[PDB]
Symmetry: D2
Amino acid sequence: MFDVIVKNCRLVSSDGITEADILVKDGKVAAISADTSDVEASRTIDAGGKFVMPGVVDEHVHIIDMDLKNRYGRFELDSESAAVGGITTIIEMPITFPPTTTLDAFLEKKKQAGQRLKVDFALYGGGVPGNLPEIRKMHDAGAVGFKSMMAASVPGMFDAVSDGELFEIFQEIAACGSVIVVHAENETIIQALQKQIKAAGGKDMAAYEASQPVFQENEAIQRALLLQKEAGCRLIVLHVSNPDGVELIHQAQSEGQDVHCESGPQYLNITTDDAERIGPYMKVAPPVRSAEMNIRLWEQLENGLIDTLGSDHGGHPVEDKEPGWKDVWKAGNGALGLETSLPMMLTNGVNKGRLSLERLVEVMCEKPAKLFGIYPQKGTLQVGSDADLLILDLDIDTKVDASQFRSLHKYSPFDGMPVTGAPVLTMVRGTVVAEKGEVLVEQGFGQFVTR
Amino acid sequence: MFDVIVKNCRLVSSDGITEADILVKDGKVAAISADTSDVEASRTIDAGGKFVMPGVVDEHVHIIDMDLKNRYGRFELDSESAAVGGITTIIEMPITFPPTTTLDAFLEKKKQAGQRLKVDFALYGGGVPGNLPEIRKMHDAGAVGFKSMMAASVPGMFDAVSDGELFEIFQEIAACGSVIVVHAENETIIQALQKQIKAAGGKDMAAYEASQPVFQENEAIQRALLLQKEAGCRLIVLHVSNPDGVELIHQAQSEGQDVHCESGPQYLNITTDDAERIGPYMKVAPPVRSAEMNIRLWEQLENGLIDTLGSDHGGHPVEDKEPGWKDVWKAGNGALGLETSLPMMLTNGVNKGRLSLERLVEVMCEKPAKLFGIYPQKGTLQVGSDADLLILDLDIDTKVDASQFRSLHKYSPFDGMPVTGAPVLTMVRGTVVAEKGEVLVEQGFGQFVTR
Amino acid sequence: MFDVIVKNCRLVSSDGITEADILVKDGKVAAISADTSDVEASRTIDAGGKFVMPGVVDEHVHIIDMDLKNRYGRFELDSESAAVGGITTIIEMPITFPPTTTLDAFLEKKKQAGQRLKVDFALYGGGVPGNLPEIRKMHDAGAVGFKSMMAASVPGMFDAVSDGELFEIFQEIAACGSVIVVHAENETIIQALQKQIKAAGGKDMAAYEASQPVFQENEAIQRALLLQKEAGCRLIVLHVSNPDGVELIHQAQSEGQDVHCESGPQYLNITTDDAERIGPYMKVAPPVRSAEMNIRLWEQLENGLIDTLGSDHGGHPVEDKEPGWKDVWKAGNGALGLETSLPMMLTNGVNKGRLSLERLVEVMCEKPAKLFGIYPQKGTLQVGSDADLLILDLDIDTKVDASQFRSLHKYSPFDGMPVTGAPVLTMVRGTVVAEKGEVLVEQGFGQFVTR
Amino acid sequence: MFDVIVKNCRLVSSDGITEADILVKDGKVAAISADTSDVEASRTIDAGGKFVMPGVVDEHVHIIDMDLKNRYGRFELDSESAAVGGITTIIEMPITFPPTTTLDAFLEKKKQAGQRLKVDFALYGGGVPGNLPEIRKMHDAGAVGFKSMMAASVPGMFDAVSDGELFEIFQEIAACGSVIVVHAENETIIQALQKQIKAAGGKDMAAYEASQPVFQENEAIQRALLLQKEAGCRLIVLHVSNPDGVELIHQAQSEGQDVHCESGPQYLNITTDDAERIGPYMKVAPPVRSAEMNIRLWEQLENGLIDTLGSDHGGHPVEDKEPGWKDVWKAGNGALGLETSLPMMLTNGVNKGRLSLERLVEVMCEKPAKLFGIYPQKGTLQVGSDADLLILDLDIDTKVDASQFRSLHKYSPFDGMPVTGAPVLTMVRGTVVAEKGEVLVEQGFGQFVTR
Ligand SMILES: [Zn+2]
Ligand SMILES: [Zn+2]
Ligand SMILES: [Zn+2]
Ligand SMILES: [Zn+2]
Ligand SMILES: [Zn+2]
Ligand SMILES: [Zn+2]
Ligand SMILES: [Zn+2]
Ligand SMILES: [Zn+2]
């Protein structure tokens, strides 16, 4: 018989809602049918006609853990935020200590992650100066992709690469048939502008944004684009903060380049005119942009110019944020988002009419899985896929309360904001891991995913 | 129980092949499941692991019929070509006599088509000078879209519209939320060039192609594009013959315009250096282009720049073609394609490695259905869709024999060419209409489809 | 010795002001020198250090004359407006009756023009449907270029050509090495829009502008561009009214196409928010555009995107304008400009800081002469050129008084507007034809110019 | 009276040839007249109707001199090459030792240059990391512009700047209203490619070209363009070697950016398929490109896409070139060109019909002078300009003989090539400095020019 049947689902995919029931066996979708009146299942879930979507696949997560677990994030804590947030599979970036830039470091993180994570996961390897030969190694060990930075953030730990190093990395990535994602900003210009701005006595959030303007973010995007154009590797530009950058990438992919654009809920749901009340808790890199650009971004999203959405969830000890209120240059970059990503998009996007459910599923589930090659398995509900669903409730009334976060850190740029939609049940591989705010699975439940 | 079960299917969609069985009831897909070992069905079909795809949806068909049925095509004859060709639903153009440019003419064609067609169908209305108010009427009667010509072909019967008339039609179409497809060429330039070329004594197929060069085809595309840009109606440019035109449209849709590009097997599988041996049987409008352009076209197809494929199946009394061997200007335009469309794409595209099955299904099934709004119903195999499938056989060895055609006319540009892949079973709404070359259904079986 | 010496000139050319004296003999510049202290001349003019520029060459004039001289304009009257306006050579369009579309009509107009004009002149031939062979004839008789319309204005008298006819004309023009200028608008769309707008009861100036929107003007420009791209003839798009059209042409010339952009003082010095007080006296085709577009236009001018400036001077019996106040559709298109062109540019351009003298001379003297091949002779003051100068006075204070116009008609869109700069002496071929508002030469003084 | 009269000149400017005589007094053009039959001059030169053009203004010269004068070039020697080559004013780059990156270094070079140069000169200042405040100083001391490198060549002596440093330099330049020229290549990518190529055992000229491919040259151009777009300073991209780069710059200037393109006779008259016989004597940076690209370059030149031509004359001890025959990586970059620039363009451009005299004068005389603000003075022959002419002879038959060079070094990529046109008399400020191969002026004759 069947392990579980979720019935009366208004199942959503990127191209439409279909009414059916899902039959799951051995952790995967065994069948999708119009009527299950006469089939037996050990467990039965009635969706009661609510929307059911595939588990969210977040390609941009910084739980960090490892030697810095007591300062940034713990697999067993933050992965609970994912679970309640409806994010069933994450791809951990390699920014941590030790840096995931070695086969050894990689194998160790995989072992650890597998023992403490509560949702499924895939892993990135790091592409830093001088570790070129390790890339092939991590690829063979299961890494789905790699990250390189054009502008650092944690010097010594994870360094930025020069155009030549970046170019060599692009060639290796192309030869392995992997994926390379980059943080595109101009390191050198940011430094110059910081000095000019600091000298003029700027300590604002406004001063911060100006030190890393769009023209430099866009120059880096342009540069990465020109180099991929020559290397041919699949490239994803991470957290693109402005409309013009989205267009640059779109235009290029539209011309045949295997390049894609990622943005995130922080850039869509926050504006520079929130800088004053949110302060350092909104300090992220690239900077959140203007209200005017924000409008454009939302149009591009619904219209298909933004390929994927990633949270860029990443903690920072609260004591490295608070000093930012008086002097911005003393607060670190980052914002948690694992627990607020879906509800924020559902709330200000879907329930506010500026985003369709179909598109949301495309950018938060399908494309990320597709781009990394973990597709049929994650990202959709078809016969053969892992049974990763979310039963949604678009008629909720509540607020985001950062202190209730399951992650190591308890603060958020969205703290206090209203939430009108959210996943109320989330299951991975056929088992309920979170139901109405409760995680029901033990640490280690999460499996490594690849291909 | 179930009416029929097709098992061991290697089911193909635009984004991948999934292994499952299809359960159909009351003419629609009732379920898709990994295993059907213990379910009862009146009839059982074993695909034996062959590829199964949705029935092909051809948006560009000219069976014509009506008062000219004994000269161009008959619903009960040509629709049999569709059936064996794997084309389960067609959309008849309104070029016939009387012209389908009136609510009355429309209602009459629907009645007739419904009584004699063997595959399902949707209908176009015509947008000609002076019939503006009839458009709203046909829309309300179920027309899925409309056609207008920028360059005539059958003066008196179906006339070309001027930019102003075309613009007014675009506005009506936008207001109805319908679709407008156009034949884009420059009537006036073609006439001028014809005179110059005829005067120089050109009677070639080469002379023909030169009389309707790409620069004029592309100018018309550019013009239609500028007008839709202003009207906002969904626009599909029919049979685009050259790479540059495809790019123009792609660029524009890529900029936000709801415009799409259609091409067909005649333009992909035939080249001007076939002109000498095929002669007038290859004379179509727009003209088939050069071998060099042909290469580009094939790349654009696999790469996603070509949105849909339509056969542009259309007969002409064989006595209006043969005189073309000696004097090209005396042969009419047109080519049959209902029976050779899929096998030609399967043969020279899929089985020759320059086209993926996934993409083929996208341009021959999904997009056409989607663009006209008959989607979930036709174009895919999901729970709720009409059970329209094709069991394929990509390991065939045979030739196309025009004399075996089931249509009124028995000739083809592809006559004699090899066929290595073809549908071997085709069913619409759960019933086998054609099995290994035999039509098994009576005239009238076809239903009207809309929305 | 020398016939005349103009000393203490601050001589302006497109690339700078140089301080010197001009020595003229036998109607042409015989020398330019830093000091003329010891040379004898029959007559001596002291510019006293004021700016001296070449006579303005206006390529877009509609004095009309001929059988309609008592209704539109007379050579001996309007050419006096040119003289005081600083326009030393004009190129008469062929829109008149009889139409200058024949060798005979051309020879007759040349004879007449030569007997009554007071400034020098060049002539256009007409390119209308069916007169293709006359073009070669007029070219050989001295025509500098030809005009064709894509949207009519005086049906029966001068007709618009279709794309095919226009294309054939382009080929003839290329083969003769002549110039073709066109009025680019979409005839058919304008008609459709007129009907829609009239039906909704529009009788405004606003209603007028909307009936011939920019999208149709720009479509025509795009179309002409595509056809010249194929023909290779020198093309000048006349009176371009909007920024986007200027860009389209600029982009194309920038890509190697021998195409150029013309605009005029009516489009730079008038805005739609002047429509209410100026009414029908501002009704011209293409329509004057918005204030926002006006700003762009001025930038493009100073920046080099606008190649030439032409007045498009053309009268209309005042009784065909006045009824326009109540019903716009009953007023004819056109505006006088021969007497207000330079002063308007000098006043609102140069003296207002948004246009440099150097650029003004480039677009009003040099380029027009250059494009038509009458260059060294007209358009500059070099050794060998006709001595055509203007002594300017950029420190004037006065108003334009249409009733003082020397032309047949006495009204203007600029009537009442202030004038702070104007030519105060104008001479052609070494003789003063106008000095401080007085014409001093008899009818017939004007010579035919060509090459 | 007059110091000298050059009569029967067929005087050429960017827009045409005019027949006249030039009267010079006190080193400048005092008059230009059609006939000088009755004027007295101390000296009389009869051009006999040959073409007369302004002295060539070369903006890209590396005589170097200073502490390295016995190794690279001497002002009194190389300036003689300029004189016979028809180059009347040069602008010395600041790459030398000590580097011209200081007010002191600048003042010293000016003193020296003024005492030993034989043709007139202007000076560049250097923009290197850390000397930002010196720029304002050199500007005030008369520097016409500054140079910065994006890819080094002489590390330690002249360093490349990072994007931030380059950006700060752009801002200073904009604020001073000066000019900044840059060497645009990607330093870091070149290094990476060098390693890959050397490892594969490449020691070719072919191997060299591949180590600094067009994609990296063009990326740097793109980058400089984006930064100027933001800074607004006048920018000239030096020695652009390929068609695509020319287009990138052209497109940008065409969009309003004050950016310009420079190329030189080495890139137009040499091709990679000359690499084998010329070897290291053709090794320059950026590398000379392919024959196919060469064709494009020549079209762009005559068509106006290339703004200026500079020789990039620069010596290298012959012992640092010869080892290049066996191992390319051991030969230095550079090529002499002061003596072969004009004759090479005259010979393979003008006398071969692919370049007009008018355009040649525009890119070799007018624009360079204009862009640096030394215009009316240098670059043309108008009343008030320095009398700098060249009497040309386009009917010569001879070969370039590097051993006859007047410069310190005696070798050239053009050695042995035919010369069919060349200046046969060259004068600066009214005095003959070179006549038929003989320099007739003493060292120090050259004056400093500025503004
Ligand atoms: Zn980042
Ligand atoms: Zn991140
Ligand atoms: Zn057609
Ligand atoms: Zn058709
Ligand atoms: Zn007009
Ligand atoms: Zn006109
Ligand atoms: Zn250089
Ligand atoms: Zn150099």
